Structure formats: C-alpha cells, structure tokens
Amino acid sequence: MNPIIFIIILLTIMLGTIIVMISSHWLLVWIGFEMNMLAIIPIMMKNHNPRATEASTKYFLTQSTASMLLMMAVIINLMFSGQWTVMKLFNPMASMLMTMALAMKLGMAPFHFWVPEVTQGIPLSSGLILLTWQKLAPMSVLYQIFPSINLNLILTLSVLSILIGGWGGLNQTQLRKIMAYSSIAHMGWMTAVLPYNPTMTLLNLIIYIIMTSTMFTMFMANSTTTTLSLSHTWNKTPIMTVLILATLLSMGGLPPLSGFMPKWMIIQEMTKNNSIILPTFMAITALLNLYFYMRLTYSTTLTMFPSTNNMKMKWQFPLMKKMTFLPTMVVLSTMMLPLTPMLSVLE
Amino acid sequence: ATFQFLPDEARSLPPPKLTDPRLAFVGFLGYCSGLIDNAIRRRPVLLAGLHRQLLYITSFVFVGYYLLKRQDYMYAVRDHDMFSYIKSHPEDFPEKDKKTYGEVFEEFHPVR
Amino acid sequence: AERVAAFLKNVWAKEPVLVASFAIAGLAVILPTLSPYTKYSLMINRATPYNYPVPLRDDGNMPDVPSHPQDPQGPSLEWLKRL
Amino acid sequence: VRDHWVHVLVPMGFVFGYYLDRKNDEKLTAFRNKSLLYKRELKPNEEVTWK
Amino acid sequence: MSMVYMNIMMAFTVSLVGLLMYRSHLMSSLLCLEGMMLSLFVMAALTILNSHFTLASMMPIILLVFAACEAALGLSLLVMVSNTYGTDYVQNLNLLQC
Amino acid sequence: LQYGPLAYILGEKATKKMTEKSKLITVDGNICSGKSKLAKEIAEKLGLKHFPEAGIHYVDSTTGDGKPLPVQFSGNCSLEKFYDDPKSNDGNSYRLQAWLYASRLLQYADALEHLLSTGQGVVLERSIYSDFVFLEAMYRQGFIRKQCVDHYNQVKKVTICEYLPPHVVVYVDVPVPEVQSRIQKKGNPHEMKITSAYLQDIENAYKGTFLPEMSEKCEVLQYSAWEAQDAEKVVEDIEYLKYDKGPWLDQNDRKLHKLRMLVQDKLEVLNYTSIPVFLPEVTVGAHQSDQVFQEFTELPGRKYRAGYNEDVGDKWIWLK
Amino acid sequence: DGPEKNYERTMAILQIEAEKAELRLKELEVRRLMRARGDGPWFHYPTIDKELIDHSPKATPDN
Amino acid sequence: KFYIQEPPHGSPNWLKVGLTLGTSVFLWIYLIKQHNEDVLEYKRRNGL
Amino acid sequence: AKTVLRQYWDIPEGTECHRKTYATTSIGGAAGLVVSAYSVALKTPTSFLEGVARTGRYTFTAAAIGAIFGLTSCISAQVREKPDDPLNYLIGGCAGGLILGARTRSYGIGAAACAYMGLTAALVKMGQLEGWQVFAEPKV
Numbered sequence A: 001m002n003p004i005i006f007i008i009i010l011l012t013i014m015l016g017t018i019i020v021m022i023s024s025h026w027l028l029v030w031i032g033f034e035m036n037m038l039a040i041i042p043i044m045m046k047n048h049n050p051r052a053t054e055a056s057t058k059y060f061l062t063q064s065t066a067s068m069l070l071m072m073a074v075i076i077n078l079m080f081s082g083q084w085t086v087m088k089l090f091n092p093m094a095s096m097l098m099t100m101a102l103a104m105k106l107g108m109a110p111f112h113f114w115v116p117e118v119t120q121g122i123p124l125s126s127g128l129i130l131l132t133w134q135k136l137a138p139m140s141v142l143y144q145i146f147p148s149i150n151l152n153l154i155l156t157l158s159v160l161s162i163l164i165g166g167w168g169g170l171n172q173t174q175l176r177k178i179m180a181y182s183s184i185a186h187m188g189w190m191t192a193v194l195p196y197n198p199t200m201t202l203l204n205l206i207i208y209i210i211m212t213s214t215m216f217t218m219f220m221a222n223s224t225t226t227t228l229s230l231s232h233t234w235n236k237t238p239i240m241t242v243l244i245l246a247t248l249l250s251m252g253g254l255p256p257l258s259g260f261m262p263k264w265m266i267i268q269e270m271t272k273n274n275s276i277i278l279p280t281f282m283a284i285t286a287l288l289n290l291y292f293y294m295r296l297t298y299s300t301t302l303t304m305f306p307s308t309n310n311m312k313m314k315w316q317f318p319l320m321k322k323m324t325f326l327p328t329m330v331v332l333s334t335m336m337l338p339l340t341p342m343l344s345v346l347e
Numbered sequence B: 001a002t003f004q005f006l007p008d009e010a011r012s013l014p015p016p017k018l019t020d021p022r023l024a025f026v027g028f029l030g031y032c033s034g035l036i037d038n039a040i041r042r043r044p045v046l047l048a049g050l051h052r053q054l055l056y057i058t059s060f061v062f063v064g065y066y067l068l069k070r071q072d073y074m075y076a077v078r079d080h081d082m083f084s085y086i087k088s089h090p091e092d093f094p095e096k097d098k099k100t101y102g103e104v105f106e107e108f109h110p111v112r
Numbered sequence C: 001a002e003r004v005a006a007f008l009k010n011v012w013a014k015e016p017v018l019v020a021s022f023a024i025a026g027l028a029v030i031l032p033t034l035s036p037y038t039k040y041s042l043m044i045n046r047a048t049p050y051n052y053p054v055p056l057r058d059d060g061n062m063p064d065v066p067s068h069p070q071d072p073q074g075p076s077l078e079w080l081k082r083l
Numbered sequence D: 001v002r003d004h005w006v007h008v009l010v011p012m013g014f015v016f017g018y019y020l021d022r023k024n025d026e027k028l029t030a031f032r033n034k035s036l037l038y039k040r041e042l043k044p045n046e047e048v049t050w051k
Numbered sequence E: 001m002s003m004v005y006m007n008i009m010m011a012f013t014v015s016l017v018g019l020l021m022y023r024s025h026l027m028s029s030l031l032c033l034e035g036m037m038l039s040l041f042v043m044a045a046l047t048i049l050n051s052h053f054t055l056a057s058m059m060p061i062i063l064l065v066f067a068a069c070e071a072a073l074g075l076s077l078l079v080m081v082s083n084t085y086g087t088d089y090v091q092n093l094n095l096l097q098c
Numbered sequence F: 001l002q003y004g005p006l007a008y009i010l011g012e013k014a015t016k017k018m019t020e021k022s023k024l025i026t027v028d029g030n031i032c033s034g035k036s037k038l039a040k041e042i043a044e045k046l047g048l049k050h051f052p053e054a055g056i057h058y059v060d061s062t063t064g065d066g067k068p069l070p071v072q073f074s075g076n077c078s079l080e081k082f083y084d085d086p087k088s089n090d091g092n093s094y095r096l097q098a099w100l101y102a103s104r105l106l107q108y109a110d111a112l113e114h115l116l117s118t119g120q121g122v123v124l125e126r127s128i129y130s131d132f133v134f135l136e137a138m139y140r141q142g143f144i145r146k147q148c149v150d151h152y153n154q155v156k157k158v159t160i161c162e163y164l165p166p167h168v169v170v171y172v173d174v175p176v177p178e179v180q181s182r183i184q185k186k187g188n189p190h191e192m193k194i195t196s197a198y199l200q201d202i203e204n205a206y207k208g209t210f211l212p213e214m215s216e217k218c219e220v221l222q223y224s225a226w227e228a229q230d231a232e233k234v235v236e237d238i239e240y241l242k243y244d245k246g247p248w249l250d251q252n253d254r255k256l257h258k259l260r261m262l263v264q265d266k267l268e269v270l271n272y273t274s275i276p277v278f279l280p281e282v283t284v285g286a287h288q289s290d291q292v293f294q295e296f297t298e299l300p301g302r303k304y305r306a307g308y309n310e311d312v313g314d315k316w317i318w319l320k
Numbered sequence G: 001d002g003p004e005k006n007y008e009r010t011m012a013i014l015q016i017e018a019e020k021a022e023l024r025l026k027e028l029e030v031r032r033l034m035r036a037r038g039d040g041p042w043f044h045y046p047t048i049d050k051e052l053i054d055h056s057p058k059a060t061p062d063n
Numbered sequence H: 001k002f003y004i005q006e007p008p009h010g011s012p013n014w015l016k017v018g019l020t021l022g023t024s025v026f027l028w029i030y031l032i033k034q035h036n037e038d039v040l041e042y043k044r045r046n047g048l
Numbered sequence I: 001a002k003t004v005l006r007q008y009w010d011i012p013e014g015t016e017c018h019r020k021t022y023a024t025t026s027i028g029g030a031a032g033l034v035v036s037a038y039s040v041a042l043k044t045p046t047s048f049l050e051g052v053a054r055t056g057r058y059t060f061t062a063a064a065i066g067a068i069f070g071l072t073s074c075i076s077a078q079v080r081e082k083p084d085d086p087l088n089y090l091i092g093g094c095a096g097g098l099i100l101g102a103r104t105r106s107y108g109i110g111a112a113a114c115a116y117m118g119l120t121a122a123l124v125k126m127g128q129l130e131g132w133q134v135f136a137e138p139k140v
C-alpha cells in the first residue's frame, strides 16, 4: 500500500469512529459504522494471502449483518417515536435488536466466533486496530442507550463472554488467538457494569486498550506470533521479556498492577447495587484468563526455552521497529494503581 | 458545561500544588518511561539522552497536572451536588435521635 | 509566467480535452463569485411565494406592514419586472 | 567520595522519611491540647503542647 | 400497526433467516443481505412518507447509497475468494479453523 | 533521513536512481571454477559493486568494527571440519549449511539494499537461489539427515519468497575431473579430501535443478572454463541482453518501496532463519546460549547500540 | 512520642475517618433517591431539546 | 573510527536535541504561568 | 423461562409433588433442547437420524436430571416436614448428579456432579429464602 493511501485509509477508520461518537442522529451513527467498516477491510487484506481474504470476508459478513440489524432497530424506533435522536430507544424489540447488533460488532459471546479467526488471519498491526480502536464506536453507543437495554440480556452476554473468553484461551498456542479470547473476556467486564455505572465501563475500556496495545506492540517489536517464537525473546531482547511479564500480570488483574483497578472498581459498583453472586462468579472465572497469561510468562520470562544456532546472527543487529509509545504504555499498563482516584475525570 | 475539560466554574477551586505527592508520582512515572525507552533500544539506561529523559518527565508532569485539576474538580462537584440535594429534600435526611450507650440495649455474647 | 506558458502550450498540444475540462471546471468555481447577477438569483428564489402569506394581527404599531396587498408597504417586485 | 557515596542513600532515606513522618503530625493537630483527658492551660513560654 | 408493515417486516425476517442459513454460494448469501436492505428501504420510506417527515425524505437515498457501496465491497471480496479457489463456496473458507 | 515512508513520500523513489545499468549479477559454478576471478572482472568492467562470497564470517564483516569474531559466536561452524569429518555426530555439517544460508540471505539483502538505494548494480558469487546445491550434495552423500533437508526447505520457503531473483545468472561449467585437479593444485589440505562423488552431486543439482529453474525467470549465460578467461567477451554478452523475463519487469515504485523497507531491516530479514523447529543439529540449550550471549555482550563495542559504546570512543552519549 | 501526642493525634485521625464514613453512607442514600426519582443532577438522562422546535406559521393551519 | 559502517546515531541530531530541550523549557514556563494564573484567580474569586 | 419458573416457585415446598416434578422436568427438558440445538448446529451430525438421536439423548438426559431433582427434593421436604430447608435441595441436587453419572456411565462424573449440583441446588434454596439477586436491578 502506498504510504499516503495507508494514512488516508487510517484517517477514515478514525473518522468513521468519530462520527459515531459525535453524532446525535441514528442515521449518522449508522454511516459512521459503514464508513469504518469500508476502511478497515483494506488493512486486513494488505498482505494478500488466502488467510487474509478469508478473515476479511468473515469480518465483512459479520459486520454487515450487524449493521443491517442496527438499521432495523433504528427504523422500528422511528415508527414508535417519530424521531432519530441517539438516546434511549422507545421500543423493547428495537432495544433487543440494537443490543444484539452491538454485541455482534463487539464480538461478544455467543457472537464471538469471528474474533479469534479474524484476528489470526490478519497482521499484528491490523489485529491491534481490530481489538482496540474498533471497540470504541460500539461501546460509545452502548454508553448512550443503556437506560433502555434489557438487564437480563446484557448480563447474560457479559457472563457468557467471560466464560467463553476464559475457556477459549486455555487451548491456544497462537498469540493472536490468545489476545482474541482475552478480548472476549474483557468485553464481558465492560458490559457487566454498564447497567450500574457506565463510568466504570469507560475506565475498563481505557485500561483494556492501553494494556492490549502494549502486548501487540511488544509482539510486533520481535515479529512473534506464536508461543514458541515468543520463547526466544530471552536470548535476543531480555528487557522485552520483563516488560511482557509485567504486562501479562497486569492483564491478569494482579495487584498492585494497573489491570487490577478495573476489576476492583467494577466489583465495588456491583456490590453497592447488592449484586454479590455475579461479581464473585466473575472474579473467580477471570482466574481462567490469569492461567493462560501465566503460561505465557513461564515460556517467555521465568524460564529459558531452547534456542537455535542462527539466533546468534540476530545478536549483531539492533531493533529497528518503531515501537511507538511503548515506553509510555508499558508504564501505564503496570504502575497506575496508586492514581486510581483519577478515574473521576471520566465522569 | 458541555464537552469541556475544565469548565469555568472549576477556577474557583484551589489549584493542585506543584509539590502535590500525586504529581510527584506522575513525574516519577515519566522518569521510569525514559529509562525503559533507553533499555528497549539498548542504550546506557541512566546516561543516554538526558534531553529525552527530561521531556519524558516534563510531559508526564504537564499532563498529570491538568488531569489532577479535573479530578479534584469532579469530586468537588460530586460533593456540591450531594449537599444541595440533601438540602432540597430535608424529609429524606432527618437528624437521627441519638441515644447514649447507657440507654441502648445490646445483647451480650460471652466467650467461654 | 513563461515556464507556465510553455507548460500550457504542451498540454494544449497533447491533451486539449483535459485542458478544456480543467478550464471549464475552473470557470464554474470562479465566475459565480465575480458575476454581478449572482445576487439576483437569491432574490428571485426568495420572491417566489410557495405557501400562503399568513396575515399578522394588527396591534396598532406596525406602520411598515400593509393593510391591503395594493397598499404601498411591504416588499416590491418592481426590480424583478425590469430584470 | 565517588567510591562510597552510595552509602548515604539509605541513611538519607531514613532522615527524609523521619522528616515526612513529623510533617504528617502537623496535619493532625485538630485536637492538640483539646482532648478531655490531657487538655490543660499553657505554660507561660509554651506556644503548643506538642509538635 | 398498518397491514403493510406486517409483510415488510416479514420480508426482512425472511431475508435475515436466509442470510443466517447459508448453503454453499457466497453470492446467494450476499443477495439475502441486499434483500434486507431493500426491505429496510421500503419500511423507512413508507414510515417517512406517511408521516410527512419532510427532511427525512432523503434518508432512504442515503441508505441506498451507503448499502450499495457496502455491496460493492462484498462483491469484491467474493471475486477474490473465487480467484483463490475457483468457486465462491463458503466451505472453502475454513483455513482459520486452526 | 533514514529511509522510510516519509522519505519515500518526499521523493526517494527507486525508479529515479535506477538505470539500465542497475542490475543484479550472480556468478555460479562448482568448487574451484574460477568464478571468484570472473566475478571481480565483471564488476570492474561494468562498474558494479563486487560482493565476495558470503562465508561463515560475512555478518561479522558488516557489523561492529568489521573484523571476524571468535568461532563460538558463529555457533562453531567449521568448513574445515566439514571436509575432515562430514559425518560428525555433533551435527557440524548441517549447522554450517544452515548458517551459510542465513549468511547468504543477509548478503542478498545488503546487495538489494545497495542496488535500490544507490542504483549501482552488484555482482555476487552464488546466492540463496543456488545455496541448495551444497545441501543436495550433502544429503546425497549421507552427510546430513532427511530431517535437516526438510528444515532447510521450510526456512527457504518463507525467506526466498520475499526477494527478486538476479537479473543475470552466470554459470562457469567446469567438469568434475578438472575441478578435482584444480583442487589438488590449490593445496588446501582439507579441501583435497573432497571426493568426486560430492562434486558430481553439486554439478547435477546445478544443471538438473538450478539452471532450468533460473532460466524461466532470469538471463542465464553459461561459459566453459576457457571461455570464462575471456572476461571482455563475458561483459560484452551481458550488455547485449534483452531482459524480457522475470518479475523485475513488474516492479514499480510502490513495490520497490515495500522491498526496500524489508531489506534495510536486517532482523526482519533473518526472522524465519530461527523458526522454532527443534532439530538437534541447530538446537542450542538454554545454558549454552545464555553463556555465549553474555560473552558476546562483553566484546568491544557490542554491549550497546552502535554509537552508544563509550569503550570504543563514542561521545555525547548523554545527548544521543 | 509522648502519650499525649499519640492520644490526640489518634483523635484527629478518628474525626477524619468518621467524617468520611458518614459521607460514604450519605452518598449511597442520595444516589438511591436520585436514581429512583430522577429529580437530581445525577442519573439525568437526556430528553429532546425544545429549542429544536420551529414555531413559525406553517403551510397549513392545523398544527 | 571503530565501526565499519557509520552508525545512524554516531553524532547527535542537534536539531532534534534543540527542539527537545526547547519543548521541555516551554512546557515548564507554560505550566508555571498557568499555575500562577490559577492561584490568583482562585484567591480573587474566594476573596482572599 | 419466566412462567415455568413462576409455577415452580409458587407451589409451597414439600407439597404438590407431581406439580413440582413437572416444572423441573420442563425446565430440564428445555435446557436439554437448547444444548441439542447448539450441539447440532456447531457439530454437524453425520446424518439426519444421528442428529435426532443426539437431540433425544441430551434432552432425555436433561429431563431425567430435572425430574429427579424435583421429586427427590419435594419428597425430602414432605417427609422431613421441613419446607424452608436448603438440605432438601442439596439432596435433590446430588440425585441429579447420580443420574448424570448414569447416563454418561462414569462414577467419577456422578460423584463430582452430585457434589457440585448438590451444592448449587442448596445455594439456590438459600438465595430464594434470603432474596439473593443474581441479576440485581440497578439501584445506586
């Protein structure tokens, strides 16, 4: 891809998201999703191979189906209220359709099957966009329509996502599939707290994005996409192995690291609402995520896996990949817990 | 206000001190980022590019200060809203009649 | 001035169709701002009465509102008759 | 001494922490000389009972 | 509601079930996706015209334009799939199983 | 301005610097074919940059101070050991071959980076396209295992696919009896232990596989030993080539920008030469690799990124 | 530290903590009423802005 | 001359160094000015 | 699921056993049908009859567990004369675990199911007694 075209396509992915976030009209929200999906496909296809073509097609079918369901929800809402304003919907069937559509866009269980497959089939930089920037627009709509979402539906989606994400990640050796199942699990926490306090949804989204970007950036730095390939990092860039360890423990929600903060705050909001079983079930189930995060720390940082002879040739060359913002993101990913009261800026 | 980071009414609050402990921690985080930047690029960690390390601290402190300003303003607004609501609805927040422990009956549970 | 003139002569010799396209498109963008008649298109569009002109209740202090359509108060289309 | 300056790091840290611990006491003077148990009239030269 | 709405919603449901129940051809599934758009266009146009929502009269056009652009992207993916495998059968798109 | 998308946007497009003299030439042949001498004369006469054949220490020549490093930092690959004991149980035979393919891959990237950045052509002696003839000879003589061959093909599959083939392939065809005579005359004690069967295997792979394959996509010129002596006729042959084949006709600025971003990033070049395939010949245990890596970081000018090593005279480290 | 300093420092600590504890209980009670009744600044969900309405005379009279 | 190939970071990028330090100075001057202006507005608004 | 759960929780415990057993059998059967639907959708049966057989095997298994839990838990409460007792549910939950140890024929699964379905059933009774909310309505 021509570098100027790449920039314009990236700017259009962002513009589609921004249109969703600033729109007060359902039609313009729908346009933002359509524009965003138009521009994302070329970056999934950019390495020209059958796996990328299959990933883009599966992505197109999922997202186009979800956008039709969203349009249907908008039109039912129009018939039963005669207006287009982005806010609570005025029809329960419209609310269900919009909630299901946004769940499909987010890749929440049981609409999750596309996330591991699409992420596996596209390059790391494209997977980084898919699992971070692409969550912004659907979450920003849930943030606004939540007063009318069915509580049982949204909490069922949350519970299923945490279970499917945790279980699905246990069986993965591909790094892109691990991040995909991790994303499904984390979307579950974001939506579980939405009915009670949307500010905690934003907090979990922001911290999720920071930690996810850090992992993908460190994977890109070494061009690693499998567990075994990552296990050679200790013999090339020892500093990276330590940063991965800290980030993985943070993603596992261990105190005193940053990733504990969203789980801590979400549990607090739920208990204030006399929700005790669900937070406890959620916290225990998230130990499945911690398990397959720990497995990666074992093969990356806490033990030294076997190397190859050609690895010595790599010793003579320095890392040349950009690793943009990596030093900043890794610090935020791990060392933010003492600043937890700062979440009020998100109010 | 509306889509305003620090509305005009936030200017009535005392600003965070430049020696705020939270701002010191934010500066410390920027310093740690500077060292990690040296490490991942295999430069002498403590000595390389002090100009780069200085800007890491400055950038964190600069952003941290405004974030701390907004944080304190939001909590001031939470308290403002709460107290005004307690006044608006005195019927829901009555002064409880307080009794001394000489009058209040508490069951005794021996540990034997 | 000359190197541009030497540029125009080349495209005029090689791509007269494209030179004409760009020339016409430029005139379409520029001339409306220069034309003295452009202001009349606004006035004529506003002078076309698509819906009923609902009369105002007379409160005794509207000397600029005609009481009858054939009175001399209110907008006049004399400028349009000449145009 | 460029060979033995690291030996001030921990002792200075103790002195600094001592100083900060005393600074905290100054933020907790709300009841200084005001408890029912110890409240007393001040000595002629005394400004405060403790600091 | 009005009697026409019964069948327009039925058409959307029929095409949605058609979309979610794949056979072999990817093109057959892309046609169902356009079917949902056409039913959405009719339902929106009827609602807007009957209610005399004047400024909303452009909305069905915008729906048509954007969804046709979506369909053009969908067709382009279909031909790339067909170039790879010689058909547009969905069963060939199972590499990411592992 | 180190090359990147920004430099490309601002006008650093490969087609600007390239000419009809911008060509990649590779000279091939059996051992002791005088291909080294021919390669130098072609480069001198055509004004090209000559690359001596990539050996065990080619990468050392491009990094640090450019001088060779101790053997343990190349994994203990010895060509001399290959001749003395081609069937050693330590796996030196394939470990040398895997190392040499990586050395050629790195050299091919340097040559392509030189061609695309400056526009000056280059002359190589053998390349990643002909490295396999030695692998075939090794396997057919029973020096390496079938698993080693499978590993080699896996690594070659995901690496060679990224790079354009040479513009001109030059083959100097010398018969095995004449090759065997020149070897005994060269008087290298280890090389004289080479056997005609091994040499015939190299020739068979060259003629059976290499030349037919390169003929489809490159310009192939074949000279006997006598004809190679006439370098001026060889250069004359090259300059009268039509060039009507291969992918070099499909290249444009956008594709050559993508190619230049690959070849300049050497770690990206070598990424798959260390795929985690646990072949005993090339697998190194953690304790050894840890110990050797620690020694490597102690070598002069190797602890830090180039330009940040005070121990070899770098200055202004606190403003860099 | 003498006992008087520790004793009265304790009282200062207890006063702050008890004041915070009361405010935490008050906030939960205020949130409960605001969410149930919708009469406060919090849980104020948007409704259509009435400045969007056009009040000028229309093409037909009955509206 | 130790390195066989001149390293990309052999000599400091003085323009980048100058911009980097200049940017740091600007942010500190701006921050102190903003803080000072904030303190006065606070004292004025509260009558202190 | 709402109405079926409403019939069950309206009948007083320890009484009207046949109605309690019907309510749990319908609940168990529905769960079996849902599992069959996803199983058939995601793991395509080799034939039409294999898929029908799988649907019956799963649905009957799930209805079998539902029936035994309802009957055993209602029989226990009736016999012991303890309506509001979580122990009755603990007994019925283990009975279901044994059935799942029989349909799958695995003493290990039965033992594990009885403990975990037994504990889960007891917690459900406690939650009903004390008003525990799984999907709590937002309140603050």
Ligand SMILES: CCCCCCCCCCCCO[C@@H]1O[C@H](CO)[C@@H](O[C@H]2O[C@H](CO)[C@@H](O)[C@H](O)[C@H]2O)[C@H](O)[C@H]1O
Pocket: C022, C023, C025, C026, C029
């Ligand atoms: C006066 C303004 C009127 C408004 C015009 C409306 C907008 C029309 C936008 C058309 C922009 C086309 O821009 C066009 O880009 C290419 C760049 O490769 C240029 O063309 C260039 O590439 C071609 C090959 O394709 C070369 O043979 C040619 O020598 C070179 O000029 C054109 O000279 C330029 O006209």
Ligand SMILES: CCCCCCCCCCCCO[C@@H]1O[C@H](CO)[C@@H](O[C@H]2O[C@H](CO)[C@@H](O)[C@H](O)[C@H]2O)[C@H](O)[C@H]1O
Pocket: C029, C030, C032, C033, C034, C038, C039, C042
């Ligand atoms: C890739 C991006 C392409 C964007 C292209 C946009 C090109 C726009 C060019 C025309 C814009 C101005 O075009 C014309 O300018 C004159 C200014 O003298 C305006 O003003 C004229 O009409 C108005 C009526 O509104 C009169 O009140 C005014 O007296 C008169 O001067 C016209 O209302 C406008 O029709």
Ligand SMILES: CCCCCCCCCCCCO[C@@H]1O[C@H](CO)[C@@H](O[C@H]2O[C@H](CO)[C@@H](O)[C@H](O)[C@H]2O)[C@H](O)[C@H]1O
Pocket: A277, I005, I006, I009, I010, I119, I120, I123, I124, I125, I126, I127, I128, I129, I130, I131, I132, I133, I134
């Ligand atoms: C390993 C453990 C795994 C997690 C186990 C989690 C157990 C959670 C406890 C189950 C949830 C509580 O169960 C639910 O409680 C409420 C109490 O208001 C009951 O509420 C019931 O009360 C009245 C009368 O009592 C009934 O007429 C009515 O049908 C129903 O509203 C529900 O009938 C019951 O379904």
Ligand SMILES: Nc1nc2c(ncn2[C@@H]2O[C@H](COP(=O)(O)OP(=O)(O)OP(=O)(O)O)[C@@H](O)[C@H]2O)c(=O)[nH]1
Pocket: F029, F030, F031, F032, F033, F034, F035, F036, F037, F053, F079, F082, F096, F097, F100, F131, F134, F135, F191
């Ligand atoms: N095992 C192995 N040996 C190799 C490889 N490439 C070169 N060699 C060895 O390197 C040695 C010298 O290479 P040559 O250039 O062919 O011999 P030369 O006589 O010096 O040069 P020419 O006269 O041009 O043929 C030979 O003994 C080869 O066996 C390889 O890929 N594998």
Ligand SMILES: N=C(N)NC(=N)NCCc1ccc(I)c(Cl)c1
Pocket: A196, A197, A198, A199, A344, A347, B074, B075, B077, B078, G031, G042, G043, I140
């Ligand atoms: N929706 C919720 N359940 N929570 C919520 N946002 N409550 C509003 C109360 C609140 C809390 C903190 C701050 I700082 C502010 Cl200003 C207001």
Ligand SMILES: [Mg+2]
Pocket: F035, F036, F053
């Ligand atoms: Mg030679």
